[PDB]
Short mmCIF file of C-alpha atoms (C1' of nucleotides) and ligand atoms in Angstrom, two decimals:
data_model
loop_
_atom_site.label_atom_id
_atom_site.label_comp_id
_atom_site.label_asym_id
_atom_site.label_seq_id
_atom_site.Cartn_x
_atom_site.Cartn_y
_atom_site.Cartn_z
CA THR A 7 176.63 302.03 225.70
CA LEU A 8 180.18 303.43 225.34
CA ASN A 9 181.89 300.30 223.89
CA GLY A 10 178.63 298.69 222.74
CA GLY A 11 180.02 297.80 219.34
CA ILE A 12 182.81 295.69 220.82
CA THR A 13 180.65 294.18 223.54
CA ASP A 14 177.87 293.12 221.10
CA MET A 15 180.50 291.35 218.99
CA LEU A 16 181.95 289.51 221.97
CA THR A 17 178.49 288.50 223.11
CA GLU A 18 177.62 287.26 219.66
CA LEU A 19 180.85 285.22 219.68
CA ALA A 20 179.99 283.93 223.15
CA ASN A 21 176.52 282.84 222.00
CA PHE A 22 178.06 280.91 219.12
CA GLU A 23 180.33 279.04 221.51
CA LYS A 24 177.49 278.26 223.89
CA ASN A 25 174.66 277.45 221.48
CA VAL A 26 176.60 275.68 218.71
CA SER A 27 180.18 274.76 219.57
CA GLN A 28 179.23 273.86 223.15
CA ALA A 29 182.68 275.12 224.15
CA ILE A 30 181.80 276.42 227.59
CA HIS A 31 185.22 277.84 228.43
CA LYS A 32 185.30 279.89 225.22
CA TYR A 33 181.77 280.98 226.12
CA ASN A 34 182.89 282.30 229.51
CA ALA A 35 186.10 283.80 228.08
CA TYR A 36 184.12 285.92 225.63
CA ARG A 37 181.49 286.62 228.31
CA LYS A 38 184.07 287.69 230.88
CA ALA A 39 185.94 289.93 228.42
CA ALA A 40 182.60 291.45 227.37
CA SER A 41 181.70 292.40 230.97
CA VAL A 42 185.02 294.02 231.91
CA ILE A 43 184.92 296.06 228.71
CA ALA A 44 181.31 297.16 229.27
CA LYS A 45 182.46 298.40 232.70
CA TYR A 46 185.45 300.26 231.26
CA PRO A 47 184.67 304.02 231.46
CA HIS A 48 186.82 304.80 228.42
CA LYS A 49 186.22 304.26 224.69
CA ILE A 50 188.54 301.49 223.58
CA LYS A 51 190.32 302.59 220.37
CA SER A 52 192.57 299.54 219.85
CA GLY A 53 193.00 295.87 220.68
CA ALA A 54 196.26 296.70 222.43
CA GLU A 55 194.38 299.04 224.75
CA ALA A 56 191.85 296.29 225.30
CA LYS A 57 194.55 293.70 225.98
CA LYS A 58 195.40 295.61 229.14
CA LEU A 59 192.08 294.65 230.72
CA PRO A 60 191.65 291.28 232.52
CA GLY A 61 190.02 288.53 230.46
CA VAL A 62 191.27 290.11 227.26
CA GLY A 63 194.02 288.07 225.65
CA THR A 64 195.63 287.87 222.25
CA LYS A 65 192.69 286.60 220.20
CA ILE A 66 190.02 289.00 221.50
CA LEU A 67 192.58 291.77 221.00
CA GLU A 68 192.95 290.84 217.30
CA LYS A 69 189.17 290.60 216.90
CA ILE A 70 188.74 294.04 218.50
CA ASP A 71 191.21 295.46 215.90
CA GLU A 72 189.32 293.84 213.03
CA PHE A 73 186.01 295.11 214.35
CA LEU A 74 187.25 298.65 214.92
CA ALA A 75 188.65 298.86 211.39
CA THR A 76 185.84 297.19 209.46
CA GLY A 77 182.76 297.37 211.67
CA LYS A 78 182.54 293.59 211.19
CA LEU A 79 184.07 290.19 211.97
CA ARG A 80 184.70 287.74 209.14
CA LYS A 81 184.20 284.97 211.69
CA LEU A 82 180.74 286.33 212.52
CA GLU A 83 179.79 286.84 208.85
CA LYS A 84 180.54 283.21 208.08
CA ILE A 85 178.48 282.06 211.06
CA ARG A 86 175.65 284.23 209.82
CA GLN A 87 175.93 282.52 206.45
CA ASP A 88 175.87 279.09 208.07
CA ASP A 89 172.22 278.03 207.87
CA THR A 90 172.26 275.14 210.37
CA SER A 91 174.22 277.17 212.96
CA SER A 92 171.98 280.23 212.45
CA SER A 93 168.83 278.12 212.85
CA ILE A 94 170.37 276.70 216.02
CA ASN A 95 171.19 280.15 217.38
CA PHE A 96 167.59 281.22 216.93
CA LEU A 97 165.87 278.17 218.37
CA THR A 98 168.03 278.27 221.48
CA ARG A 99 166.46 281.64 222.28
CA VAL A 100 163.25 279.79 223.22
CA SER A 101 163.27 278.97 226.96
CA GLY A 102 163.68 275.20 227.32
CA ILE A 103 165.48 274.75 224.00
CA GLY A 104 169.23 274.13 224.24
CA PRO A 105 171.67 272.94 221.52
CA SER A 106 170.52 269.32 221.70
CA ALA A 107 166.80 270.07 221.20
CA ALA A 108 167.66 272.75 218.59
CA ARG A 109 169.52 270.19 216.46
CA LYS A 110 166.72 267.66 216.81
CA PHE A 111 164.22 270.26 215.60
CA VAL A 112 166.36 271.40 212.66
CA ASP A 113 166.68 267.82 211.42
CA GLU A 114 162.94 267.47 211.74
CA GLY A 115 162.62 270.51 209.51
CA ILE A 116 161.57 272.64 212.49
CA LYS A 117 163.60 275.85 212.31
CA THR A 118 161.33 278.89 212.73
CA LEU A 119 159.04 280.39 215.33
CA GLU A 120 156.03 279.32 213.26
CA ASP A 121 157.47 275.82 212.73
CA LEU A 122 157.49 275.45 216.53
CA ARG A 123 153.86 276.58 216.66
CA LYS A 124 152.89 274.00 214.03
CA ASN A 125 154.60 271.25 216.03
CA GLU A 126 153.79 272.04 219.69
CA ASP A 127 153.25 268.35 220.38
CA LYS A 128 156.98 267.85 219.82
CA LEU A 129 157.79 270.23 222.68
CA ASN A 130 158.12 269.28 226.36
CA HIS A 131 156.27 271.40 228.95
CA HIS A 132 159.17 273.85 229.52
CA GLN A 133 159.53 274.53 225.79
CA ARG A 134 155.76 274.95 225.31
CA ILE A 135 155.77 277.73 227.89
CA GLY A 136 159.00 279.16 226.45
CA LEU A 137 157.21 279.31 223.10
CA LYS A 138 153.96 280.71 224.51
CA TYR A 139 155.81 283.62 226.10
CA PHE A 140 158.69 283.98 223.61
CA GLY A 141 157.92 287.64 222.88
CA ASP A 142 157.43 288.49 226.57
CA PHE A 143 160.72 286.80 227.55
CA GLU A 144 162.61 288.88 225.02
CA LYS A 145 161.53 291.91 227.05
CA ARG A 146 163.44 293.09 230.14
CA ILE A 147 161.82 294.06 233.42
CA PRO A 148 162.14 297.78 234.25
CA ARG A 149 163.42 298.25 237.82
CA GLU A 150 160.15 300.00 238.64
CA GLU A 151 158.22 296.86 237.76
CA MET A 152 160.68 294.80 239.79
CA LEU A 153 159.70 297.01 242.73
CA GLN A 154 156.00 296.26 242.35
CA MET A 155 156.81 292.57 241.93
CA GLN A 156 158.99 292.72 245.06
CA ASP A 157 156.11 294.37 246.94
CA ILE A 158 153.68 291.63 245.96
CA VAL A 159 156.00 288.70 246.71
CA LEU A 160 157.34 290.01 250.01
CA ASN A 161 153.82 290.59 251.36
CA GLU A 162 152.43 287.24 250.14
CA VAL A 163 155.10 285.15 251.84
CA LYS A 164 154.31 287.13 255.02
CA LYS A 165 150.63 286.30 254.46
CA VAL A 166 151.37 282.58 254.46
CA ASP A 167 153.71 283.07 257.43
CA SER A 168 154.95 286.32 258.93
CA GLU A 169 158.18 284.54 259.86
CA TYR A 170 159.11 284.19 256.15
CA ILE A 171 161.91 286.38 254.81
CA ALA A 172 161.96 287.07 251.06
CA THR A 173 165.04 288.70 249.48
CA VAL A 174 165.08 289.74 245.82
CA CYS A 175 168.50 288.98 244.39
CA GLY A 176 170.07 288.70 240.93
CA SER A 177 170.58 291.89 238.94
CA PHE A 178 167.95 293.77 240.97
CA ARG A 179 169.93 293.50 244.19
CA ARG A 180 173.09 294.61 242.36
CA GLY A 181 171.09 297.77 241.66
CA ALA A 182 170.39 297.16 237.96
CA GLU A 183 167.94 299.46 236.16
CA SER A 184 166.38 296.48 234.37
CA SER A 185 166.38 292.74 235.05
CA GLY A 186 165.89 289.60 232.96
CA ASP A 187 163.95 287.61 235.54
CA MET A 188 163.02 287.71 239.18
CA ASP A 189 165.25 285.83 241.60
CA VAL A 190 163.70 285.43 245.04
CA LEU A 191 165.56 284.02 248.02
CA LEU A 192 163.43 282.61 250.83
CA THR A 193 164.08 281.56 254.44
CA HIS A 194 162.05 280.30 257.41
CA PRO A 195 163.33 278.99 260.79
CA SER A 196 161.60 275.63 260.04
CA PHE A 197 164.21 274.71 257.42
CA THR A 198 167.64 274.73 259.09
CA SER A 199 170.83 273.20 257.78
CA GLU A 200 170.50 269.76 259.33
CA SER A 201 166.81 269.21 260.10
CA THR A 202 163.83 270.41 258.03
CA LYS A 203 161.00 270.47 260.62
CA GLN A 204 158.24 271.14 258.13
CA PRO A 205 158.74 270.44 254.45
CA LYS A 206 155.97 271.57 252.04
CA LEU A 207 157.34 275.09 252.78
CA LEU A 208 158.20 276.06 249.22
CA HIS A 209 154.90 274.63 247.98
CA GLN A 210 152.79 276.78 250.34
CA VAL A 211 154.43 279.96 249.04
CA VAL A 212 153.96 278.88 245.42
CA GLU A 213 150.36 277.94 246.18
CA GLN A 214 149.56 281.40 247.54
CA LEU A 215 151.21 283.23 244.61
CA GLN A 216 149.21 281.07 242.20
CA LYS A 217 146.02 281.73 244.21
CA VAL A 218 146.34 285.49 243.66
CA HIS A 219 147.32 284.91 240.02
CA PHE A 220 150.79 286.33 240.34
CA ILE A 221 152.47 283.02 239.44
CA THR A 222 150.81 281.85 236.18
CA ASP A 223 152.89 278.92 234.97
CA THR A 224 155.21 276.26 236.33
CA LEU A 225 158.56 275.25 234.79
CA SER A 226 160.18 273.26 237.60
CA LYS A 227 159.33 272.45 241.20
CA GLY A 228 161.26 270.85 244.05
CA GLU A 229 161.96 271.22 247.76
CA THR A 230 164.41 274.11 247.40
CA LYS A 231 163.72 275.51 243.90
CA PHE A 232 160.69 276.70 242.01
CA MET A 233 160.92 277.98 238.48
CA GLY A 234 157.98 279.49 236.74
CA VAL A 235 156.26 282.39 235.16
CA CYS A 236 154.68 285.40 236.83
CA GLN A 237 152.79 288.57 235.91
CA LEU A 238 151.91 291.95 237.41
CA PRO A 239 148.20 292.72 237.53
CA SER A 240 147.21 295.48 235.10
CA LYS A 241 144.67 298.22 235.94
CA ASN A 242 141.30 298.54 234.19
CA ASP A 243 141.29 299.08 230.40
CA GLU A 244 144.99 298.59 229.68
CA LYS A 245 147.51 296.27 228.10
CA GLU A 246 148.62 293.49 230.38
CA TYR A 247 152.17 293.56 231.61
CA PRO A 248 154.42 291.02 229.94
CA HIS A 249 154.77 287.60 231.59
CA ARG A 250 158.10 287.26 233.43
CA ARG A 251 160.39 284.41 234.48
CA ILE A 252 160.68 283.84 238.24
CA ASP A 253 162.98 281.61 240.27
CA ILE A 254 162.32 281.12 243.99
CA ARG A 255 164.90 279.48 246.23
CA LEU A 256 164.19 278.13 249.72
CA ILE A 257 167.42 277.91 251.70
CA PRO A 258 168.04 277.07 255.40
CA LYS A 259 168.41 280.03 257.79
CA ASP A 260 171.97 278.86 258.60
CA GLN A 261 172.88 279.09 254.96
CA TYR A 262 171.21 282.40 254.21
CA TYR A 263 174.37 284.39 253.58
CA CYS A 264 175.93 281.81 251.26
CA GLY A 265 172.53 281.73 249.54
CA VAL A 266 172.24 285.47 249.08
CA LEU A 267 175.83 285.62 247.94
CA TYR A 268 175.10 283.00 245.27
CA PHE A 269 171.77 284.33 244.09
CA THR A 270 173.02 287.91 243.90
CA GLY A 271 175.89 286.93 241.65
CA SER A 272 176.59 287.88 239.08
CA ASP A 273 177.40 284.55 237.38
CA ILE A 274 180.79 285.78 236.19
CA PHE A 275 181.42 287.20 239.67
CA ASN A 276 180.48 283.88 241.27
CA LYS A 277 182.87 281.93 239.05
CA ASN A 278 185.69 284.39 239.80
CA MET A 279 185.01 284.36 243.55
CA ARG A 280 184.62 280.60 243.68
CA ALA A 281 187.80 280.06 241.66
CA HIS A 282 189.70 282.28 244.06
CA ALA A 283 188.19 280.32 246.96
CA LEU A 284 189.57 277.14 245.41
CA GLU A 285 192.97 278.75 245.11
CA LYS A 286 192.82 279.84 248.73
CA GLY A 287 191.81 276.31 249.81
CA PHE A 288 188.04 276.54 250.16
CA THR A 289 184.92 275.60 248.25
CA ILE A 290 181.81 277.82 248.08
CA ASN A 291 178.37 276.77 246.93
CA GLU A 292 174.92 278.27 247.54
CA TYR A 293 174.71 276.62 250.95
CA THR A 294 178.14 276.69 252.61
CA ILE A 295 181.80 277.50 252.55
CA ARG A 296 184.02 274.50 253.31
CA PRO A 297 187.79 273.92 253.76
CA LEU A 298 189.47 271.90 251.03
CA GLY A 299 191.71 268.90 251.63
CA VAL A 300 195.16 268.02 250.33
CA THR A 301 193.30 265.41 248.27
CA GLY A 302 190.32 267.68 247.69
CA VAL A 303 187.93 266.22 250.28
CA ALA A 304 185.50 268.90 251.51
CA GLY A 305 185.58 269.74 255.20
CA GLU A 306 182.65 270.73 257.41
CA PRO A 307 180.79 274.06 256.86
CA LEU A 308 182.35 277.17 258.40
CA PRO A 309 180.32 279.56 260.56
CA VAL A 310 178.85 282.41 258.54
CA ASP A 311 177.21 285.49 260.05
CA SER A 312 177.17 287.82 257.06
CA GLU A 313 178.15 288.07 253.41
CA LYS A 314 181.42 289.69 254.51
CA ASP A 315 182.34 286.61 256.55
CA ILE A 316 182.63 284.68 253.28
CA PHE A 317 184.85 287.32 251.64
CA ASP A 318 187.08 287.28 254.76
CA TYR A 319 187.71 283.53 254.56
CA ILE A 320 189.21 283.73 251.10
CA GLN A 321 190.87 287.07 251.90
CA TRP A 322 188.93 289.42 249.64
CA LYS A 323 187.88 292.96 250.38
CA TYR A 324 184.10 293.00 250.77
CA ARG A 325 182.32 294.10 247.66
CA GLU A 326 178.88 295.69 247.51
CA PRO A 327 176.34 293.89 245.27
CA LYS A 328 176.59 296.95 242.96
CA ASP A 329 180.23 296.13 242.18
CA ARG A 330 179.67 292.40 241.67
CA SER A 331 178.25 293.20 238.27
CA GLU A 332 180.88 291.32 236.42
"C1'" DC B 30 204.09 274.96 226.81
"C1'" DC B 31 200.04 273.37 228.57
"C1'" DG B 32 196.15 272.03 232.14
"C1'" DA B 33 192.56 274.41 234.85
"C1'" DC B 34 188.57 276.52 234.22
"C1'" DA B 35 182.33 277.01 240.11
"C1'" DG B 36 178.80 274.61 241.53
"C1'" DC B 37 174.31 273.20 241.78
"C1'" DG B 38 168.35 271.85 241.02
"C1'" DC B 39 165.20 269.85 238.48
"C1'" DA B 40 163.18 267.46 233.96
"C1'" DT B 41 163.76 264.16 230.72
"C1'" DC B 42 166.03 260.39 228.30
"C1'" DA B 43 168.33 255.76 227.43
"C1'" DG B 44 168.87 251.26 228.86
"C1'" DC B 45 167.36 247.84 231.70
"C1'" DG C 18 159.58 251.70 237.59
"C1'" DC C 19 164.96 252.53 238.67
"C1'" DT C 20 169.78 254.14 237.67
"C1'" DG C 21 172.65 257.00 235.60
"C1'" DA C 22 173.45 260.31 231.96
"C1'" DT C 23 172.14 264.24 229.38
"C1'" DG C 24 169.90 268.45 228.99
"C1'" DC C 25 168.79 273.12 230.38
"C1'" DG C 26 168.68 276.58 233.55
"C1'" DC C 27 170.11 279.45 237.98
"C1'" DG D 17 190.17 281.79 224.99
"C1'" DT D 18 192.71 283.35 228.93
"C1'" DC D 19 195.69 282.82 232.67
"C1'" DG D 20 198.98 281.00 235.80
"C1'" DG D 21 202.63 277.88 236.97
C1 FDV E 418 173.24 281.69 235.14
C2 FDV E 418 173.97 281.58 236.50
C3 FDV E 418 173.50 282.25 237.63
N1 FDV E 418 174.15 282.16 238.80
C4 FDV E 418 173.72 282.82 239.88
C5 FDV E 418 174.23 284.29 239.89
C6 FDV E 418 173.28 284.96 239.35
O1 FDV E 418 173.31 286.41 239.64
C7 FDV E 418 171.95 284.23 239.99
C8 FDV E 418 170.73 284.62 239.18
O2 FDV E 418 170.82 284.08 237.87
P1 FDV E 418 170.37 285.02 236.67
O3 FDV E 418 170.49 284.23 235.39
O4 FDV E 418 168.97 285.42 236.93
O5 FDV E 418 171.37 286.26 236.59
P2 FDV E 418 171.08 287.82 236.93
O6 FDV E 418 172.32 288.32 237.67
O7 FDV E 418 169.81 287.96 237.75
C9 FDV E 418 170.99 288.86 235.42
C10 FDV E 418 171.85 288.29 234.34
P3 FDV E 418 169.26 289.04 234.88
O8 FDV E 418 168.35 288.01 235.49
O9 FDV E 418 168.85 290.45 235.27
O10 FDV E 418 169.19 288.91 233.35
O11 FDV E 418 172.17 282.98 239.94
C11 FDV E 418 175.25 281.43 238.89
O12 FDV E 418 175.80 281.36 239.95
N2 FDV E 418 175.74 280.75 237.86
C12 FDV E 418 175.14 280.81 236.68
O13 FDV E 418 175.59 280.20 235.74
CL1 CL E 419 185.99 275.41 225.60
CL1 CL E 420 180.00 291.30 212.41
CL1 CL E 421 177.06 272.00 251.01
MG1 MG E 422 168.15 287.10 237.31
NA1 NA E 423 195.67 290.71 229.68
NA1 NA E 424 166.84 279.00 225.89
#
DNA sequence: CCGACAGCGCATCAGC
DNA sequence: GCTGATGCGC
DNA sequence: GTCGG
């Protein structure tokens, strides 16, 4: 990509802050700057030039100058020389392993992919699966595969009940050419915002997808959220597709638009939009938009008929999913 | 010169 | 077992 | 780390 050098650096800095420092605002600052730069259709040649974009302040500006001049960051070289931090950065790439589990493992002398394999009994279920599929989960899903996955999931939910609506969100809905996981948003008139007539709903869908061996593994399971692992069927005599992460959300019909807004993101876009909502006197989550009080008490949910209704409330021009890719 | 920084679902852990 | 906190992930 | 007040 055009400014890939700069964006890789920022991302590497962001990972350090998330995985080691646990400084979540520095994480998002680097992450935000990285995304506005990656969207900038011009090759940044200086920090000063960069400083003109939003999210880019004084310190990223300086780091962009150092990187452009040397092809490196002293900060990043020292991190790379730090053995404990480096071990932590690697282990956190396994699904289910965050900074806390990474540090526990390192002190137990568990610091490599093979170390994990030799000590599987020290891993919880999520981490076992994260380890089992570690290679697969380093691989992105081509949009074309997302389409076949879409096709399977949308038909299966109709098979369990033709009144089900399944919407594929996340990066796919923003039009991305490849996606990290599959995010599926699900409704049914039986689950509405105040009375759930029939629970079990999410379980039936999961049950069917397991039955046809699309869903292969379970990470988490509740009334509104399933997290797991799925896989496209391969044709005769060929390499299986990689296993993929899937997240399915069951949301009331009356909350569908807040749900699809949330699940489409992106995460940086959601934080920006939600911050602006706060500054305009509202609060947005995946279910509702609510008025805010003088003392911060949340009011009752506002009527929502479309995604654009939510943008209107906080006085934003509607933005297509394709331009929410912050 | 500093405080704010989005919001939530589910699994596990610590202490009882 | 429960409460409440942490952990990890959308 | 950045941004707004
Ligand atoms: C992580 C996160 C997510 N989301 C919302 C918004 C977010 O879009 C949605 C899906 O989360 P994905 O982690 O799947 O993000 P994605 O856009 O699908 C993309 C990075 P890919 O999966 O192709 O790698 O959940 C948030 O609102 N806040 C968050 O912190
Ligand atoms: Cl921070
Ligand atoms: Cl470097
Ligand atoms: Cl709510
Ligand atoms: Mg996704
Ligand atoms: Na700026
Ligand atoms: Na991880």
